[PDB]
Design a binder for this molecule. Structure first.
Ligand SMILES: COc1ccc2c(c1)S(=O)(=O)NC(c1c(O)c(-c3ccccc3)nn(CCC(C)C)c1=O)=N2
Length: 557
């Protein structure tokens, strides 16, 4: 069937949207080429509608069913708990979109009786009714990039009351099942370093390693009614409370499979027969589905000792080469299979023979050296989007603070230590706002984070190594440098200078601020202070930071 059908009503915005980067007194210290940075808006959603709208054919064979049966056997070992209304309420982000039934995110969080009542009545309707399509809102995401212009991405989500019910029903499943079904292929169980560890061990466990990422064209749109029912039959394999079995079947029929789309104004826009981007099971379902399809395809294309790493719609395979000609021909077959399974490619896939060239989850493995001279592997990416967003966040307060997320996930990197950290700690000092907790996203989930805790976080996730890395590779250095010429970011000798000031200012405050100066900015000085383990390190509740994926699933931890 058709992924979408459209009545012709436009995708409308809530507030005014800004596409040109806002500029303040801090901007020029980061970025001169302001017109290179933009925010997508509802206004360009027609371009997106065009490309995500197509017909889907699907042809499922034995490799496909065999693997599905392998997955179900694992899922039948899983036991999920039905969350309480209160518990699901606590998992709602504070900035989550308000209900049309007259209550909001905070009324959910602080547990007001009006919100709890409506939620209960939504649950009860869910238990009694398994057919009635559930209303959803379609919006355009405001995201920020550098010119490469991309149309706004679409977000489709049900009402706040449904979103809470989803959590009651499925939060435990989507946190627990993916790991059991897909084992070490489940990308979201990994921190950055654990991911490098897995990619490196996988790579080097092959005689002659060949790897490739697979870029599906609009994964969401390629997901069919079949796919959604299949993944439901996977959820159903779990040991569940009778009320959870029921809610899951009903949410599958009324919501996950398809449903009407309403704009922010109340007008009807059309109908959806593919994955909704804004539901709880978005991450988990895409993952299970991508894995199911790629595992089968790898069999259909006779790939040798193939190892998969899956994150939502993001897929990378590492296997044994047969030479460039047989490798070239293996992937076309792999891609034909994926195509039959309704997962056609964007850019066709290309074999890589050097791990550092493999881009997956928008990151690559790279190498630098620790204080001992001991070669160390770490994860990095092209910093263009991180820096484009840092620019936006320099001038505008935002619901999610990506600069802080980028420091947590990309601490060992050159561009995150020398730029992100220097620039933003410089800003927090001027506002005296070091002690203030900020919101940031990790694998789709919102975390409230105190900047002063960064050293301990970084030590826990990356080891003291991360405060000592040096002699980065020429490929990494070049990309960072080339990215700065593009954006008009000051050269790295300026940031070193700024960082000496930023560090000394921090040392002066004493306490946590001086711990920040000592560890985050040790790189900046000629004669370095000695970095030992940190007393307060083993105090943070880092449980559930890298358990599962939650993107579009409206989750707060
Ligand atoms: C639609 O399916 C998805 C596919 C891929 C997804 C995600 C969803 S995600 O859960 O939004 N987060 C990430 C993700 C990040 O959010 C982030 C990230 C970046 C900056 C700030 C916070 C998180 N980083 N990486 C790379 C590092 C890890 C693979 C070790 C990511 O892959 N990737």
């Amino acid at each position: 069937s058709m992924s979408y059908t459209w009545t012709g009503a436009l995708i409308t915005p809530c507030a005014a949207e800004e596409s040109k980067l806002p500029i303040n007194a801090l901007s020029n210290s980061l970025l001169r080429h302001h017109n290179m940075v933009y925010a997508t808006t509802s206004r360009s959603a027609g371009l997106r509608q065009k490309k995500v709208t197509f017909d889907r054919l699907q042809v499922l064979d034995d490799h496909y069913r065999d693997v599905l049966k392998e997955m179900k056997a694992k899922a039948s070992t899983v036991k999920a708990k039905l969350l309480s209304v209160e518990e699901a309420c606590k998992l709602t982000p504070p900035h989550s979109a308000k209900s049309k039934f007259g209550y909001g995110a905070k009324d959910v969080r602080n547990l007001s009786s009006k919100a709890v009542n409506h939620i209960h009545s939504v649950w009860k309707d869910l238990l009694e009714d398994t057919v009635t399509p559930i209303d959803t809102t379609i919006m355009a995401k405001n995201e920020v990039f550098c010119v490469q212009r991309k149309p706004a991405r679409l977000i489709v989500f049900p009402d706040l009351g449904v979103r809470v019910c989803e959590k009651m029903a499925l939060y435990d499943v989507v946190s627990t099942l993916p790991q059991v079904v897909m084992g070490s292929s489940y990308g979201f169980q990994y921190s950055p370093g654990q991911r490098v560890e897995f990619l490196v061990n996988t790579w080097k466990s092959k005689k002659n390693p060949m790897g490739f990422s697979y870029d599906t064209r609009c994964f969401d749109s390629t997901v069919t009614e079949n796919d959604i029912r299949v993944e439901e039959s996977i959820y159903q394999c779990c040991d569940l409370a009778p009320e959870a079995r029921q809610a899951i079947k009903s949410l599958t029929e009324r919501l996950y499979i398809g449903g009407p789309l309403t704009n922010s104004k109340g007008q009807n826009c059309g109908y959806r027969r593919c994955r909704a981007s804004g539901v709880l099971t978005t991450s988990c379902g895409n993952t299970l589905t991508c894995y199911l399809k790629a595992s089968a395809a790898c069999r259909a294309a006779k790939l040798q000792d193939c190892t998969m790493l899956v994150n939502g719609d993001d897929l990378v395979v590492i296997c044994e080469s047969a030479g460039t000609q047989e490798d070239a021909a293996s992937l076309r077959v792999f891609t034909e299979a994926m195509t039959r399974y309704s997962a056609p490619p964007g850019d066709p896939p290309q074999p890589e023979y050097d791990l550092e060239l493999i881009t997956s989850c928008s990151s690559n493995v790279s190498v630098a050296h620790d204080a001992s001279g001991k070669r160390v592997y770490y994860l990095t990416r092209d910093p263009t989007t991180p820096l484009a967003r840092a620019a936006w966040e320099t001038a505008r307060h935002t619901p999610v603070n990506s600069w802080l997320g980028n420091i947590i996930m990309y601490a060992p990197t050159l561009w995150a230590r020398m730029i992100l950290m220097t620039h933003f700690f410089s800003i927090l000092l001027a506002q005296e706002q070091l002690e203030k907790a900020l919101d940031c996203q990790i694998y789709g989930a919102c975390y409230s984070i105190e900047p002063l805790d960064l050293p301990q976080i970084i030590e826990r996730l990356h080891g003291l190594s991360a405060f000592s890395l040096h002699s980065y590779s020429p490929g990494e250095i070049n990309r960072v440098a080339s990215c700065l010429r593009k954006l008009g970011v000051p050269p790295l000798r300026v940031w070193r200078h700024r960082a000496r000031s930023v560090r000394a200012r921090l040392l002066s405050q004493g306490g946590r601020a001086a711990t920040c100066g000592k560890y985050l900015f040790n790189w900046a000085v000629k004669t370095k202070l000695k970095l030992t383990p940190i007393p307060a390190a083993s105090q943070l509740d880092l449980s559930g930071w890298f358990v599962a994926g939650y993107s579009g699933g409206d989750i707060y931890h």
